[PDB]
Design a protein around this ligand. Structure first.
Ligand SMILES: COC(=O)Nc1ccc(-c2ccnc([C@H](Cc3ccccc3)NC(=O)[C@H]3CC[C@H](CN)CC3)c2)cc1
Length: 238
């Protein structure tokens, strides 16, 4: 996160750090708890990931230094990538991780509500992007979870900023015209959380952008409302 500040412990209790064990253990992507055995994240996180066996989901983490070999984590039973996904820039950048065990909800770890289909018309004015990603183009993964408040931008405005790309209605953009605050490397897969009627909703999944916090280059996110039926298809399968 560029231009953000340290989060307080328990502030984003749906935020997870997805680690890979191959070749060595390191933070791979962000993710969000959406159900007791479900993590919603970005499909691009799994490029070259051959098996869910190398993955570890850590919930209730503020600092990456809390993670040692004796730290508990959730194993991943299954990686579900949207079957229309080709690359982040073309959309369908959404994946579900089915966990091997059940997340016990509490003050440090709980789910974020998905957006309502009826709420596709609501104007979100209090949106935050969170993650352990870089604070500048060439940096390193941060120890403390960062947060930044970012305004949502219309798709017409986002399309003007991305000449040569196709910004679809299954994408949502967020950023300041002058830049300064944005997601950066290592934040991908994490949430874009918006507060509406005292309830936080998972509005976006951090996906892609041209650089980090550049003027007239907003962060591009998977527009979660457009995938509610796909999430329910996968999580409520009989
Ligand atoms: C010690 O562990 C350690 O260093 N981990 C670690 C370090 C660096 C990265 C990283 C590097 C470069 N790109 C990314 C991802 C894409 C990806 C995801 C997973 C694997 C490979 C690529 N893309 C982004 O985050 C975007 C989001 C939207 C933004 C909008 N302005 C622009 C940047 C991550 C990940 C983990």
């Amino acid at each position: 996160i560029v231009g953000g500040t340290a989060s307080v412990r328990g502030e984003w209790p749906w935020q997870v750090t997805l680690h890979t064990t191959s070749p060595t253990q390191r933070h791979l992507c962000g993710g969000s708890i959406i159900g007791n055995q479900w993590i919603l994240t970005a499909a691009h996180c799994f490029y070259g990931v051959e098996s869910p066996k190398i993955l570890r989901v850590y919930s209730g983490i503020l600092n990456q230094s809390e993670i040692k070999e004796d730290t508990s984590f959730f194993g991943v039973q299954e990686i579900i990538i949207h079957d229309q996904y080709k690359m982040a820039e073309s959309g369908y950048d959404i994946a579900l991780l089915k966990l091997e065990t059940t997340v016990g909800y509490g003050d440090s770890q709980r789910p974020i509500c998905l957006p309502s289909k009826g709420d596709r018309n609501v104007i979100y004015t209090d949106c935050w992007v969170t993650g352990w990603g870089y604070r500048k183009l060439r940096d390193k993964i941060q120890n403390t979870l960062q947060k930044a408040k970012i305004p949502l931008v219309t798709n017409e405005e986002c399309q003007k900023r991305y000449r040569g790309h196709k910004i679809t209605h299954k994408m949502i953009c967020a950023g300041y015209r002058e830049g300064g605050k944005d997601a950066c490397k290592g934040d991908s897969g994490g949430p874009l959380s918006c507060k509406h009627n005292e309830v936080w909703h998972l509005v976006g999944i951090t996906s892609w952008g041209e650089g980090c916090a550049q003027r007239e280059r907003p962060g591009v996110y998977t527009n979660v409302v457009e995938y509610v039926d796909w999430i329910l298809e996968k999580t409520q399968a009989v």
